[PDB]
Amino acid sequence: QIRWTLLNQITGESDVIPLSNNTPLNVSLNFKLMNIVEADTEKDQVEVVLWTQASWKVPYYSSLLSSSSLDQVSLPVSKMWTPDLSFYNAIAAPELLSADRVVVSKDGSVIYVPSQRVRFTCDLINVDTEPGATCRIKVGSWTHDNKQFALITGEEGVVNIAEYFDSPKFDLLSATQSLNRKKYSCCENMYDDIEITFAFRKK
Amino acid sequence: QIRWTLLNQITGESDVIPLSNNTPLNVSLNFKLMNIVEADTEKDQVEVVLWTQASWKVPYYSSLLSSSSLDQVSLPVSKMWTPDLSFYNAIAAPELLSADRVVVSKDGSVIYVPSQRVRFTCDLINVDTEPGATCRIKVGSWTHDNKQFALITGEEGVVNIAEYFDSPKFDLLSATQSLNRKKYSCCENMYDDIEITFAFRKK
Amino acid sequence: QIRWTLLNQITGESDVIPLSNNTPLNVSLNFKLMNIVEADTEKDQVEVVLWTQASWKVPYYSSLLSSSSLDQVSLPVSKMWTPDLSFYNAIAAPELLSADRVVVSKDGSVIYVPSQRVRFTCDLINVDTEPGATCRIKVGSWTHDNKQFALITGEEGVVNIAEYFDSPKFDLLSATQSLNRKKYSCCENMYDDIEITFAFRKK
Amino acid sequence: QIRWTLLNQITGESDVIPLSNNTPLNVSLNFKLMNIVEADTEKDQVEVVLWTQASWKVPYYSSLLSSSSLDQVSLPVSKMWTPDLSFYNAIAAPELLSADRVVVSKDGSVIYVPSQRVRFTCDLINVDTEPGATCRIKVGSWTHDNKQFALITGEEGVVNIAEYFDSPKFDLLSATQSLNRKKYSCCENMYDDIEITFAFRKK
Amino acid sequence: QIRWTLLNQITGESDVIPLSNNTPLNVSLNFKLMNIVEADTEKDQVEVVLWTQASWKVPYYSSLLSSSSLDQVSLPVSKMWTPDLSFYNAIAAPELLSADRVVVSKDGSVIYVPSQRVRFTCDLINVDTEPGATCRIKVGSWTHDNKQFALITGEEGVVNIAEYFDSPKFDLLSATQSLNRKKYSCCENMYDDIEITFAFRKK
């Protein structure tokens, strides 16, 4: 149902980011904060459910469906390169809540939306006040610098991090994101990250 | 015991939904709500034990058995494509409680019945009243739109979710399911989901 | 030090229950309840440590040792078909506590003894009284109906479920087992199961 | 660096205990109790950190290095057979806290030292008194009987189980062991075990 | 996009530490203490988030990129030998929080930075006084002695373990790291270890 032999090159190359020429791969990231599921005021720790909507394009993947009546194909994440996103301020390993699959379209654009439960520390002293408590989540490639992996995000038009939030216990008061590019001790080059700031209080 | 060389095609193709023609694959789901194992009123979270009874048919699979004594065969889930059903409102990774195997019939129809412990948020303010609290569970394919993967109510109808329910702690008042479809941001086509709605109260 | 090439066939057929002709495979199950390690009266949930002693025979396995001074050989579970036993009433995935290995004898009989911590719902309202609380553990193949997989067990001799029980916190008052056979609403045929009934109380 | 094609035989045979003749492999086990990290008096459960020092010899492994400048080689456990030690009285799966690797010397000697966190039941009624609480840990092969796998242990004067013990919460009062050989029911031959007995009290 | 065939040799050799000559491999380590996420004074147990910055050089790896546009390449850890660093005094298995990948440079140096949550025991008697409680973490190779694996200390600073520290619950008062060498039972050769010592208190 697909060009199966191509898929063997694709998985064969999966250890390495798929670059064309020298150009950085643009990886588009958008976030949806879905729910806050722990707000532990004694430990000062929060758990959220977050959907990371990631997409990138590898033109040579377009041959996968060229001869197929499929418009797109869903494939296990293990079959190709996917971004090594890490939460820089996670204090427990994020827990995947969705199927570990990506969708490839006819033009080679790839879409990947892990839904994860993520824990981090946050000062919850004001969580039961009208302004609420303000928390941040930082996400970026752990190992691909910005010469190879460049973060892009939605337009000031389309960004709506709180769009689908729903909780019977907490009110989500605001949610914004910055796109950052920083030098660290390890490496020649800089790393891109997006950081979400949000505020919430108890209902 | 079976046509082993066919299994090599079946496993070989297991990354991709098995379609023929354009036609979406029909996947029927029925559910058994077995137990409500937590209802935490301070966090507004509920954990249930749920069997998902999923079936679909792949004509070419029928040759697996046609010349063997066996009327059906049970195989590990890793040997073929299986639906990537996710609980859209899950707040923890569902925990599999039963052996991960499917059963293939002589005509190539397949049955898969995972038992899973699933956690999600619910407003429990009324859990201790006669009408009780109403909770919803949303299930659908994470990455196959309804051009490829169509959900249908299975043979048992919408009416037998509570058949095996047993708890010393909770009364299950009612349970039904409804089939819906939604437009998502990522994609042009809609996704099918089945939504389970149940009411329960403390004993 | 065994007939390795025969292991190629054994492992090659490990997806499928090893039948000779049409006859169902006799799988014998005996149990030892070792301990009760949680009895939560607020949640009504018990955790036990249980050994399931399972044995079956596959005559063609006898060639594995025919050439060797080994009387029996221990092998990884993954190298052959083993029974897909499940706890029908588990509310958490069972935790294996022992080496995942089976032993094949020179006559091709196979012994598999998993030790597992298993959690289930039990009404514990009477756990701190003289008669104690009565709990049940249901065990059977998840996907092999009784036309393929026949459960058998010890007579009134060899059956002593409480033989090794030790707990500083609970008295095991009595444990019994009973073979049963049920048809399920999802499914055509009947499945064998053994139900273990036990009573315990606080020391 | 090493005779790589030898390792192909070593890994190839890794499913099965490496005997020569029909002599049991001698497996030497010594223990170091490092710490007691849980003593829950409400549940009468203890957790310890324990180093198990295992070693055995497989003369044919000597060719792995005989032409190498390496005096010994550290390898992943998955590359060769290792003893299937179980804690016969564990109530949770022991958690590995150290790298899963063995060291093979020039003579074919193998050393494997896992550090594990292990939970057991123990009557803690006297933990806060002078006699302390006395606990036992029993360890042996789960599936290799003493016709194949024979335990040996420290030349009874260099058995010092308490040697590196260190805790700010508990005094280890004593720790000894014995080497036992017992008959089991599935089992026509006997199984070796070492039982550690220790007494501790709250500081 | 790289020299794939060379990667076959690198992975083929991944079981074994990469030495040239009889020279010890220099493995450089620096640490960043990110957070203290638990200090349980009842149990005298501490959890921290720590980045371990490791680097080492393997000259023959330089041919991986020789003919490529990439100045460096990120690869999954499973593709090459990486150090078997263990927390000698961990009381629970360290939890990895970051993507499991390394970066290989044009000259064959390798960078690996695991973020981990690590638990250990610490006398917390003084955690709530001005000088605070002093804790220690010991890191080194579990199975590579210092004739094969030599520890050298990080490239930027030695008291700046705290560069990224942030906690709403605790003040970090001091942090230092120090190289040591310790002799063990198993081995006629010594193992290097780095000991982080830090003092912290409740805010």
- d(CA B143, CA B82) in angstroms, rounded, equals 12
Given a contact cutoff of 8 angstroms between Cβ atoms, the answer to whether D118 and D35 are in contact is no
DSSP state of C82: -
B–D contact: 3+ Cβ pairs < 8 A: no
Given a contact cutoff of 8 angstroms between Cβ atoms, the answer to whether A65 and A2 are in contact is yes
How distant, in Å, are the alpha carbons of B83, C158, D12, E5 from that of E11? 34, 53, 18, 10
Please calculate the CA angle C106-C107-C110 and round it to the nearest 5 degrees: 85
- d(CA D82, CA D56) in angstroms, rounded, equals 9
E101, E109, E167, best to mutate vs chain A, most A CBs in 10 Å: E101
Neighbours of A81 (CB within 10 A): 19
Phi-psi region of C71 (alpha: psi -120 to 50; beta: other; left: phi over 0): alpha
How distant, in Å, are the alpha carbons of C19, C166, E112 from that of B3? 15, 49, 47
List the end-to-end C-alpha distance of chain C, in Å, as a whole number: 51
Token representation of residue D176: 């000894």
* Strand-strand pairing, E25-40 and B72-76: unpaired
Chain-centre distance for alpha carbon E145: 16
Nearest-CB residue to D121 (from C97, C102, C168): C168
Amino acid identity at D10:
I
SS3 content of chain D, % helix, strand, coil (to 5): 10, 45, 45
DSSP state of A24: P
Token representation of residue D192: 């070796």
Q: Is C195 helix (H, G, I), strand (E, B) or coil?
A: strand
DSSP state of D189: S
Given a contact cutoff of 8 angstroms between Cβ atoms, the answer to whether A57 and A108 are in contact is yes
Unique residue bearing structure tokens 């550290």: D74
Residue E38: closest CA among chain A residues belongs to which residue? Answer: A43
Query: Dmax of chain C from CA atoms?
Result: 59
How distant, in Å, are the alpha carbons of B41, D91, E17 from that of E180? 52, 37, 21
For residues A50-68, b (16+ Cβ closer than 10 Å) or e, as one string? Answer: bbbbbbbbbeebbbbbeee
**Subunit contact C143:B35, Cβ cutoff 8 A:** no
**Is the CA virtual torsion B4, B5, B6, B9 positive or negative?**
positive
Please calculate the CA angle D23-D25-D29 and round it to the nearest 5 degrees: 145
**Subunit contact E2:A16, Cβ cutoff 8 A:** yes
Residue B109, class by beta-carbon neighbours within 10 Å (0-12 exposed, 13-18 middle, 19+ buried)?
middle
Q: Is D38 helix (H, G, I), strand (E, B) or coil?
A: strand
Please calculate the CA angle D139-D142-D147 and round it to the nearest 5 degrees: 100
HSE (side-chain half, CA atoms, 13 Å) at A26: 8
Ordered by where they begin, the domains of chain D are: 1-203 (2.70.170.10)
Given a contact cutoff of 8 angstroms between Cβ atoms, the answer to whether B113 and B98 are in contact is yes
- d(CA E93, CA C67) in angstroms, rounded, equals 43
Q: Chain E contact for A38, CB < 8 A?
A: no
SS3 content of chain A, % helix, strand, coil (to 5): 10, 45, 45
Residue A187: closest CA among chain E residues belongs to which residue? Answer: E111
- d(CA A53, CA A75) in angstroms, rounded, equals 16
For residues A112-124, b (16+ Cβ closer than 10 Å) or e, as one string? Answer: bbbbbbbbbbbeb
- d(CA D15, CA D9) in angstroms, rounded, equals 11
Amino acid identity at E167:
S
Token representation of residue D10: 């070593």
Given a contact cutoff of 8 angstroms between Cβ atoms, the answer to whether D19 and D58 are in contact is no
Enumerate the β-bridge partners of residue B194.
Answer: B139, B179
Chain-centre distance for alpha carbon B144: 15
**Is the CA virtual torsion D121, D125, D130, D131 positive or negative?**
negative
Given a contact cutoff of 8 angstroms between Cβ atoms, the answer to whether B203 and B190 are in contact is no
Q: Which residues of E touch D1 (CB under 8 A)?
A: 13, 16, 18-19
**Is the CA virtual torsion C26, C27, C32, C35 positive or negative?**
negative
Q: Which long-range contacts (CB under 8 A, 24 or more apart) does A152-158 make?
A: A152/A26, A152/A27, A152/A28, A152/A29, A152/A179, A153/A28, A153/A29, A153/A30, A153/A177, A153/A179, A153/A194, A154/A28, A154/A30, A158/A30
* CA-closest candidate to residue E151, choices E110, E180, E186: E180
Backbone angles phi, psi at B26, to 5 degrees: -85, 120
Token representation of residue E18: 């990469």
Given a contact cutoff of 8 angstroms between Cβ atoms, the answer to whether A84 and A142 are in contact is yes
Q: What is the DSSP string of D90-152?
A: BSSPPEE-S--EEEEETTSEEEE--EEEEEEE---TTTTSSS-EEEEEEEEESS--TTTEEEE
**Is the CA virtual torsion B7, B9, B12, B15 positive or negative?**
negative
* Strand-strand pairing, D149-152 and D133-141: unpaired
- d(CA B123, CA A169) in angstroms, rounded, equals 8
Enumerate the β-bridge partners of residue B48.
Answer: B36, B118
Nearest-CB residue to B92 (from A2, A99, A117): A117
Residue E153, class by beta-carbon neighbours within 10 Å (0-12 exposed, 13-18 middle, 19+ buried)?
middle
Q: What is the DSSP string of D172-183?
A: EEEEEEEEEEEE
Enumerate the β-bridge partners of residue D58.
Answer: none
- d(CA D202, CA C98) in angstroms, rounded, equals 31
Q: Chain A contact for B17, CB < 8 A?
A: yes
* The three-state (H, E, C) secondary structure of E43-83, written as one string: CCEEEEEEEEEEEEECHHHHHHCCCCCCCEEEEEHHHCCCC
- d(CA B123, CA B40) in angstroms, rounded, equals 10
Backbone angles phi, psi at D19, to 5 degrees: -95, 155
- d(CA D188, CA D193) in angstroms, rounded, equals 16
- d(CA C35, CA D43) in angstroms, rounded, equals 12
Q: What is the resolution of this structure in A?
A: 2.0
Token representation of residue A20: 């064309």
**Is the CA virtual torsion B75, B79, B82, B84 positive or negative?**
positive
C88, C96, C186, C195, best to mutate vs chain B, most B CBs in 10 Å: C186
Token representation of residue B55: 């079936």
Q: Nearest CA to CA, how far is D163 from chain E (Å)?
A: 11
How distant, in Å, are the alpha carbons of A49, A84, A89, A95, A104 from that of A139? 14, 10, 8, 15, 23
- Count contacts between B and C (CB, < 8 Å): 87
Please calculate the CA angle B173-C183-C88 and round it to the nearest 5 degrees: 65
Q: What is the DSSP string of A107-138?
A: TSEEEE--EEEEEEE---TTTTSSS-EEEEEE
- Say how many residues make up chain C: 203
Q: What is the dihedral of CA B72, B76, B78, B84, to 10 degrees?
A: 70
Chain-centre distance for alpha carbon B124: 25
How distant, in Å, are the alpha carbons of C154, D36, E173 from that of E42? 49, 14, 22
Neighbours of C40 (CB within 10 A): 14
Q: Is A7 helix (H, G, I), strand (E, B) or coil?
A: helix
- d(CA E189, CA D71) in angstroms, rounded, equals 10
- d(CA E116, CA E97) in angstroms, rounded, equals 5
Enumerate the β-bridge partners of residue D194.
Answer: D139, D179
Q: What is the DSSP string of chain B?
A: ---HHHHHHHHHTTTS----SS-PEEEEEEEEEEEEEEEETTTTEEEEEEEEEEEEE-GGGGGGTTTSS-SEEEEEGGGS----EEETTBSSPPEE-S--EEEEETTSEEEE--EEEEEEE---TTTTSSS-EEEEEEEEESS--TTTEEEEE-TTTTS-TTTT---SSEEEEEEEEEEEEEE-TT-SSEEEEEEEEEEEEE-
**Subunit contact E15:D76, Cβ cutoff 8 A:** yes
Q: Which residues of B touch C12 (CB under 8 A)?
A: 4
Residue A188, class by beta-carbon neighbours within 10 Å (0-12 exposed, 13-18 middle, 19+ buried)?
exposed
Contacts of D129 (CB under 8 A, 6+ apart): D201
Amino acid identity at B102:
V
Q: Is C5 helix (H, G, I), strand (E, B) or coil?
A: helix
Q: What is the DSSP string of chain E?
A: ---HHHHHHHHHTTTS---STTPPEEEEEEEEEEEEEEEETTTTEEEEEEEEEEEEE-GGGGGGTTTSS-SEEEEEGGGS----EEETT-SSPPEE-S--EEEEETTSEEEE--EEEEEEE---TTTTSTT-EEEEEEEEESS--TTTEEEEE-SS-SSGGGTT---SSEEEEEEEEEEEEE--TT-SS-EEEEEEEEEEEE-
Token representation of residue C126: 């009477």
**Is the CA virtual torsion C104, C106, C109, C111 positive or negative?**
negative
Nearest-CB residue to C44 (from B30, B70, B168): B168
Given a contact cutoff of 8 angstroms between Cβ atoms, the answer to whether A56 and A181 are in contact is no
Token representation of residue D26: 């001698």
Token representation of residue E50: 């720590």
- d(CA A110, CA A97) in angstroms, rounded, equals 20
* Strand-strand pairing, B45-57 and B72-76: unpaired
Q: Which chains touch A (3 or more CB pairs under 8 A)?
A: B, E
**Is the CA virtual torsion E85, E91, E97, E99 positive or negative?**
positive
* Strand-strand pairing, A101-105 and A109-112: antiparallel
- d(CA C4, CA C105) in angstroms, rounded, equals 15
Q: Is A180 helix (H, G, I), strand (E, B) or coil?
A: strand
**Is the CA virtual torsion E135, E141, E146, E149 positive or negative?**
negative
Given a contact cutoff of 8 angstroms between Cβ atoms, the answer to whether A97 and B92 are in contact is yes
Token representation of residue B72: 């059906």
**Is the CA virtual torsion D122, D128, D129, D132 positive or negative?**
positive
B5, B35, B97, best to mutate vs chain C, most C CBs in 10 Å: B97
- Say how many residues make up chain B: 203
Chain-centre distance for alpha carbon A167: 22
